[PDB]
Amino acid sequence: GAPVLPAAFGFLASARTGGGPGPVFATRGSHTDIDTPQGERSLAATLVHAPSVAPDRAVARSLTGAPTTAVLAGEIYNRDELLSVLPAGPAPEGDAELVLRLLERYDLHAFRLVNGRFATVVRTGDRVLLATDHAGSVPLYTCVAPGEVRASTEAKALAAHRDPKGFPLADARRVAGLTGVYQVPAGAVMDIDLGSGTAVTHRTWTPGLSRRILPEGEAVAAVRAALEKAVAQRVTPGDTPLVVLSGGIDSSGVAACAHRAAGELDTVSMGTDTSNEFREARAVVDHLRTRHREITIPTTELLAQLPYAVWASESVDPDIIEYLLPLTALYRALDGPERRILTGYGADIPLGGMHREDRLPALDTVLAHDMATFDGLNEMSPVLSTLAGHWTTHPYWDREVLDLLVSLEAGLKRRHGRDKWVLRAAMADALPAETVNRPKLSGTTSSFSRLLLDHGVAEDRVHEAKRQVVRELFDLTVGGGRHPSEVDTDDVVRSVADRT
Amino acid sequence: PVLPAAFGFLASARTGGGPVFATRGSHTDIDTPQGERSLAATLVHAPSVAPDRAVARSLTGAPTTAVLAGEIYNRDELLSVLPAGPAPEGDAELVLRLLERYDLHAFRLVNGRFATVVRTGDRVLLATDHAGSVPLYTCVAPGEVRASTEAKALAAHPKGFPLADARRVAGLTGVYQVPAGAVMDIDLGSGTAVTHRTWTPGLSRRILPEGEAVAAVRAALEKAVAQRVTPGDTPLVVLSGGIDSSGVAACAHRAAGELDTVSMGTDTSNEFREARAVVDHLRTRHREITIPTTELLAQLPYAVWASESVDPDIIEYLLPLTALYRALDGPERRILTGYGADIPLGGMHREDRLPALDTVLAHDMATFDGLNEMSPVLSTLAGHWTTHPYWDREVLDLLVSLEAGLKRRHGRDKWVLRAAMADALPAETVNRPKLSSFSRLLLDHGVAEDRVHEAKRQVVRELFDLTVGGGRHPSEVDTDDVVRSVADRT
Ligand SMILES: [N]C(=[N])[N][C][C][C][C]([N][C][C]C(=O)O1[C]([C]2O[C](N3[C]=NC4=C3N=[C]N=C4[N])[C]([O])[C]2[O])O1P([O])(=O)[C]P([O])(=O)OP([O])([O])=O)C([O])=O
Ligand SMILES: Nc1ncnc2c1ncn2[C@@H]1O[C@H](COP(=O)(O)CP(=O)(O)OP(=O)(O)O)[C@@H](O)[C@H]1O
Ligand SMILES: N=C(N)NCCC[C@H](NCCC(=O)O)C(=O)O
Ligand SMILES: [Mg+2]
Ligand SMILES: [Mg+2]
């Protein structure tokens, strides 16, 4: 009875003094322009959303008949908490309206209260607000100049224009490979004066730098409770969600929580002609009695996802692109209706899932560095899945779960010789023993690294070779306006190798 | 011990080459086992305490020496993450045990009121508590690291490269103040430093129903105060008629089972009547001290000398507090204050509309570092130790995080704190809302508005260059002439 997918996946909005640009998105869906009642003084916007579901809940307007409009891509998770701090009403219907009602009470500080997965733009008179969620999980880009502000959930839609009129902004980073396009920082709200094109940015969240010791038993129960809540908030009542499942504790944990929340669950696992964790996942599938699907794709197909992954994430970090190849392939391979998907992605970051020794200092060093450098990588962008029409959400990076996991002392993250111990302990009563204490996972190269090595690229120049390949795929797809389908990936890789 | 093992220090680590503090107390130079290649230091402490617990040594990793000024409050928590069972002697040793397990990240775990310097081999660590409540300064050059809890001891000296992530002390040269909530990792040989922040104000806000918010605030304050009260010893609370100090008084009384209070007044105003209500409700041993406005202003050079602050507004807040600590009679005391509660709770906010409350809150939290308004020297200059419950790391994190509607609610300021103490204080106290001698001084010497706030900055800066920069005792500074010169200079 309730909408299973967000009211809108993305948008291209515009606020200009005068004038009057068809959006090109990687995100799949209907393109619907919102009404512009105040004419040139209104906020113009094209929303990309789930076909057949009108995007009404992604737009909100003034209740006093004034020039104030808000557009929101994504969704909010702590709705009951937010509803509890609002005056008489009326009861907001949709997240854009919830945001607007909150802005009426706290102005821009409203964003310090929201725990969600969204990107939003608001125009009030000649003031424009742009805001991201705490982790910038829904990328938001902008082109600001005196008299005109353009904002979009995909940089490519802003670059599609001839020489975007975008200039430097406080806290906003210039997008490499593009001109005039800047990315709004994660956990922030930019307050823009339309006339001058100047902006003041306020951060609404930042990774904790301190660590808090809690009674052991309590810490473990707290992690389980927070994960259970975050997952429940992400599951639509009346709809059985899909969990992308691996053999690891991360995705297994989300599956256990999701099954409890929905009463039933669907799971899917992807594998290649070289490796898979089908047996490991089946252990959880049988334990939970889920409707499971196994998908095997040749390595040539997985690597064929290179341009799609770059095009969707608009990221140029080769390491990140590699993590995304498998997921990009999985989302495109799914058959049937558009799904609400939950993943165990991200757990490794605050927990130092890569740490491999009992010594704790290096774990905190890496963790702190990771939390200070995730912004701009766009690794959890919804476009990765929406390019195929599916919505994805990541429980481990829920603001409450994230704050808690980041804050725990290192001895809880690496213990008894096991990685992410606190998470394994938190779920030890909901999963089979083998899943709970099976090590995270020696000479094995990634298929992307293998691809360059198979081209005869010296192994010490492979990583830089991968960086150059991605860089060129970005220039063709995001900067050039070329569709992934039109990219001769082989030629690109061959070219980079021939110059290495 | 009722007082910390050390109030402050002047330390150094170099190759092989005393101090004068505002802090009142004994001086003890620690042993130098490794000779010229060890950590040399002069600790200033209460005559009644052994400085031993303020120094710890070990051979773990390399010859190591730690010096710590102040104290740690979440000791039980810290002890819970350590191996074996040989409990540390004091806080300096506790830090050393933590460093062995988490290295510099150990500081991300500490909730205290301290400043510490550690030398392990040719590596030097300089660390402050989350709020930098105990100022720490340093001079860093290749082969020479000097650290002090008072810039004045470092100003009295020649060399000291620029430290990027730290702030230069006003007027002084080569002297830097270690940022709050940070640990500076220095390589002695190269004189290069890397600074890691171990705490930062939360920017997000939390939503909680009244009942839970009220209960959490009460529980957090009770704990932070219990941690600050020595078992067996009755503490002293500097009490005004306000909810902040009253809230601390109620918690300290509960924790100590007894309580000593003191309120100060001037010939201009006082809150003796307001405080009396609380004095009787908790039945404490109360004392009222009235200081002439003339004596209040005479504190100008003492407050600058002790706080080493150049901020006129902060200096004015500190004049009465400084007069009070110096006027206290009897033995050295462990004192708790309700200072700082207005910052995270937006105590100065006067409207029901919330936007401005959060704007000022975020700004205040991003700019408190360097003001030194809660420095222990303000009270130790008179032998007394102060600690501030509201800026306890746990209490602070909680109060800062609360959504504005819990701070301004039912038309009352700092609502959640008032509600949290409702069942421990008289109704009038929790219900009475929150609601310049210095200025009057300058106006007497001739100076217009828009020229007074400015002139005050010049007076404060002059006193600083004299007492902190020139190593001249406050008792030797004519605050009358300082005003004179600065007066006929605008
Ligand atoms: N940083 C920033 N931004 N700011 C800062 C500011 C500060 C504030 N406050 C104000 C000033 C002061 O001083 O204050 C405090 C404390 O101290 C003490 N005292 C005072 N006075 C006095 C005292 N004692 C005794 N006597 C006299 N006279 C106390 O303890 C306190 O706590 O405070 P206040 O605020 O002023 C008062 P209260 O008490 O708190 O109450 P209410 O409620 O009215 O407020 C801050 O702190 O923040
Ligand atoms: N082959 C595959 N099949 C199904 N889902 C997959 C997958 N590879 C990755 N995922 C999803 O993408 C996320 C990224 O995660 P990874 O860290 O690489 C494995 P993990 O499932 O998190 O377990 P682990 O990190 O404890 O080993 C997972 O949480 C999972 O939901
Ligand atoms: N942003 C980063 N620093 N890293 C993102 C990596 C994504 C990571 N999965 C792979 C496991 C690993 O090798 O860390 C995760 O947290 O799901
Ligand atoms: Mg993982
Ligand atoms: Mg106060």
**What CATH number did the domain enclosing A83 receive?**
3.60.20.10
Taking the C-alpha atoms of residue B490 and residue A322, their distance in angstroms, rounded to an integer, is 66
C-alpha separations of A446 from A308, A443, A452, B458 in Å:
18, 10, 10, 65
B109 and B254 inside one domain = no
B263 lies in the same domain as B125: no
Q: Residues near B337 by Cβ (< 8 Å), separated by ≥ 6?
A: B237, B238, B245, B248, B321, B386, B387, B388, B389
C-beta of A370 in contact with ligand 3 (< 6 A): yes
Please give the Cα distance from A179 to B458 (Å, whole number): 47
**Phi/psi at B382 (nearest 5 deg)?**
-115, 15
- How many whole angstroms separate alpha carbon A278 and alpha carbon A256? 17
Sign of CA dihedral A408, A411, A415, A419: positive
Non-local (6+) Cβ contacts of A429 within 8 A are: none
Last residue of a domain, one of B161, B184, B201: B201
CA atoms within 13 A on the CB side of A89: 4
Q: How many CB atoms sit inside 10 A of residue B15's CB? A: 10
Helix (H) / strand (E) element for B397: namely helix B393-401
H helix intervals, B229-292 = 243-256, 272-282
On whether the CB atoms of residues B254 and B221 are closer than 8 A, the answer is no
How many domains does chain A fold into? 2
Helix A318-333 with A306-313: angle, nearest 10 deg:
100
From CA B205, how far away is CA B403, in angstroms rounded? 5
Omega of the bond prior to A90 within 30 degrees of 0, cis?
A: yes
Residues 6+ apart with CB under 8 A from A339: A241, A242, A266, A390, A391
Determine contact, residues A81/A58, Cβ cutoff 8 Å: no
A415: nearest CA in chain B? B81
Cα–Cα distance for residue pair B261/B275, rounded to 1 Å:
9
- Tell me the residue type at A411: G
Residue A110 near residue B358 (C-beta atoms within 8 A): no
Task: Locate the chain A residue with the closest alpha carbon to B400.
Answer: A112
**Hunting for tokens 């889920």 — which residue is that?**
A290
DSSP for residue B276? H
What are the backbone dihedrals phi and psi of residue A146, each rounded to the nearest 5 degrees, phi first? -55, 120
Closest CA to A326 of A154, A492, A446: A446
In chain B the first and final C-alpha atoms are separated, in Å, by: 51
Element of type H or E holding B364? helix B355-367
Would you state the structure tokens that stand for residue A253, as one six-digit string?
A: 């944990």
Q: Computed over its alpha carbons, how large is the radius of gyration of chain B?
A: 22
Return the number of other C-beta atoms located less than 10 Å from residue A291's C-beta. Answer: 12
Number of C-beta neighbours around residue B290 at 10 A: 13
What domain range includes position B456? 202-490
**Residue A24 CB neighbours (<10 A):** 15
| Separation of CA B341 and ligand 5 centre (Å) | 5
Residue showing tokens 């799949």: A28
Residue B38 tokens read as 């060890």
Q: How far B402 CA sits from the closest chain A CA (Å)? A: 10
Q: Are B130 and B393 in contact (CB under 8 A)?
A: yes
Which residue, among A320, A307, A309, has the nearest Cα to A446 in the 3D structure? A320
Residues enclosing ligand 2, CB less than 6 A?
Answer: A 244-246, 248-251, 269-270, 326-327, 330, 343-345, 347-348, 353, 440
Give the amino acid at B467.
T
Q: Rg for chain A (alpha carbons), in Å? A: 22
Report phi then psi at A496, rounded to 5.
Answer: -60, -45
- Bridging pattern class, strands A127-132 and B408-409: unpaired
Structure tokens at B96: 């050393």
Are B72 and B129 contacting, i.e. CB atoms less than 8 angstroms apart?
Answer: no
Burial category of B82 from C-beta neighbours within 10 Å (exposed 0-12, middle 13-18, buried 19 and up): middle
User: What would the two tokens of residue A363 be?
Assistant: 């774990």
Q: Closest Cα partner for B373 from B443, B303, B429, B428?
A: B303
Helix (H, G, I), strand (E, B) or coil at B254: helix
The yes-or-no answer on residue B288 being catalytic is no
Other C-beta atoms closer than 10 Å to the C-beta of A415 total 17
First-to-final CA distance of chain A:
57
Q: Which residues contact A200 (CB under 8 A, 6 or more apart)?
A: A170, A190, A191
The number of the ligand 3 atom at minimal distance from the alpha carbon of A346 is: 16
Q: Which stretches of chain A sit within 8 Å of chain B by CB?
A: 78, 81-82, 84-85, 105-109, 112-113, 134, 187, 202-206, 208-213, 215, 360-361, 364-365, 368, 399, 403, 409-411
For residue B269, what is the DSSP state?
-
B188 and B211 belong to one structural domain: no
Given resolution (angstroms) = 2.0
Residue corresponding to tokens 């789930």: A50
CA–CA separation, A473 and A320 (whole Å)? 14
Residues near ligand 4 ion, CB 5 Å cutoff: A 250, 348
Q: Is residue A345 lining ligand 3, measured as CB closer than 6 Å? A: yes
Which tokens is A324 given? 């995304």
Would you say A206 and A171 are in contact if contact means Cβ atoms under 8 Å apart? no
B303 closest CA partner among B323, B275, B288: B323
The type of residue at B409 is R
Structure-derived torsion over alpha carbons of residues B442, B444, B448, B452, reported in degrees to the nearest 10: 10
Whether residue A379 lies in the annotated active site: yes
Quick check: is B223 catalytic? no
Q: Active-site residue among A182, A308, A345, A396? A: A345
Q: Which residues of B touch A (CB under 8 A)?
A: 74, 77-78, 80-81, 101-105, 108-109, 130, 181, 196-200, 202-205, 207, 209, 354-355, 358-359, 362, 393, 397, 403-405
The two three-digit tokens of residue B405, written as one number: 């509607």
Nearest Cα neighbor of B342 from B355, B357, B354 is B357
- DSSP, residue by residue, B428-463: HHHHS----HHHHHHHHH---TTSHHHHHHHHHHHH
Of A207, A226, A261, the last residue of a domain is A207
Q: State whether A17 and A132 are in the same domain.
A: yes
Q: What's the rounded Cα separation, in Å, for the pair B207 and B209?
A: 7
3-state secondary structure of B17: coil
Chain A residue closest to B363 (CA)? Answer: A202
The annotation status of B342 as a binding-site residue, yes or no, is yes
- Please tell me whether residues A24 and A129 are part of one structural domain: yes
| Rounded CA separation A7/A18 (Å) | 29
Residues of B in contact with A84 (CB under 8 A): 207, 209
Three state DSSP letters for chain A: CCCCCCCCCEEEEEEECCCCCCCCCCCCCEEEECCCCCHHHCCEEEEEECCCCCCHHHEEECCCCCCEEEEEEEEECCHHHHHCCCCCCCCCCCHHHHHHHHHHHHHHHHHHCCCEEEEEEEEECCEEEEEECCCCCCCCEEEEECCEEEEECCHHHHHCCCCCCCCCECCEEECCCCCCCEECCCCEEEEEECCCCEEEEEECCCCCCCCCCCCHHHHHHHHHHHHHHHHHHHCCCCCCCEEECCCCHHHHHHHHHHHHHHCCCEEEEEEECCCCCHHHHHHHHHHHCCEEEEEEECHHHHHCCHHHHHHHHCCCCHHHHHHHHHHHHHHHHCCCCCCEEECCCCCHHHHCCCCCCCCCHHHHHHHHHHHHHCCCCCCCCCHHHHCCCCEEECHHHCHHHHHHHHHCCHHHHEECCEECHHHHHHHCCCCCHHHHCCCCCCCCCCHHHHHHHCCCCCCCCHHHHHHHHHHHHHHHHCCCCCCHHHCCHHHHHHHHHHHC
- Taking contacts as CB-CB distances below 8 angstroms, the residues of chain A near B108 are 209-211, 364
Kindly state whether residues A179 and A228 are assigned to the same domain. no
What are the distances in angstroms from CA A265 to CA A77, A240, A245?
20, 6, 11
| Residue whose C-alpha is closest to residue A195's, from A40, A17, A42 | A17
What span, in angstroms and rounded, lies between the C-alpha atoms of A456 and B276?
86
How many whole angstroms separate alpha carbon A381 and alpha carbon A117?
9
Centre a 10 Å sphere on the Cβ of residue A272 and count the other Cβ atoms it contains: 18
DSSP code at position B233: P
CA distances from A454 to A117, A307, A458, B350 (A): 40, 19, 10, 70
A355, A375: one domain: yes
User: What are the tokens at A460?
Assistant: 């010490």
Q: Which residues in chain B are closer than 8 Å to A105, comparing Cβ atoms?
A: 354, 405
Rounded to the nearest angstrom, the gap between the alpha carbon of residue A101 and the centroid of all alpha carbons in its chain is 25
Residue B299 dihedral angles phi and psi, to the nearest 5°? -85, -15
Cα–Cα distance measured from residue B115 to residue B110, given in angstroms and rounded to the nearest whole number: 11
Looking at the structure, do residues A275 and A422 belong to the same domain, yes or no?
Answer: yes
User: Are B177 and B236 members of one domain?
Assistant: no
Q: Which residues pair with B289 in a beta bridge?
A: B264
Shortest Cα distance, chain A CAs vs residue B358, angstroms? 7
* Nearest one of B367, B407, B465 to B206, comparing CA atoms: B407
Ligand 1 centre distance from Cα of residue B170 (Å): 26
Same domain, A125 and A245: no
Residue holding tokens 């005004």? B240
Reading across the β-sheet that carries B236-238, which strands appear in turn? B285-290, B260-265, B236-238, B334-336, B385-387
Q: What share of chain B is helix, strand, coil (3-state, %, to 5)?
A: 40, 20, 40
Q: Are residues B189 and B227 in the same domain?
A: no
Residue for token pair 């406080």: A170
A239 annotated to bind ligand:
no
Count the Cβ atoms, other than its own, within 10 Å of residue B404.
Answer: 24
Residue with tokens 């209460």: B46
CA distance B55 to B48: 17
DSSP B286-349: EEEEE--HHHHHTTHHHHHHHH----HHHHHHHHHHHHHHHH--SS--EEE--TTTHHHHTTT-
CA angle B291, B297, B299 (to 5 degrees): 85
CATH number at residue A485: 3.40.50.620
**Residue B71, CA distances (Å) to A223, A409, B115, B129 in order:** 31, 21, 9, 10
- Sequence-distant (≥ 6) Cβ neighbours of residue A115 within 8 angstroms: A76, A77, A78, A81, A133, A134, A398, A399, A400
Distance, CA of B326 to CA of A142 (rounded, Å)? 58
Query: At what angle are helices B312-327 and B437-445 packed, to 10 degrees?
Result: 110
Question: And the tokens for B10?
Answer: 């002047």
* CA–CA dist A161, A21 (Å, integer): 7
Residue ending a domain, among B155, B177, B201, is B201
Same domain, B351 and B256: yes
Of all residues in chain B, the one with the smallest CA distance to A212 is B109
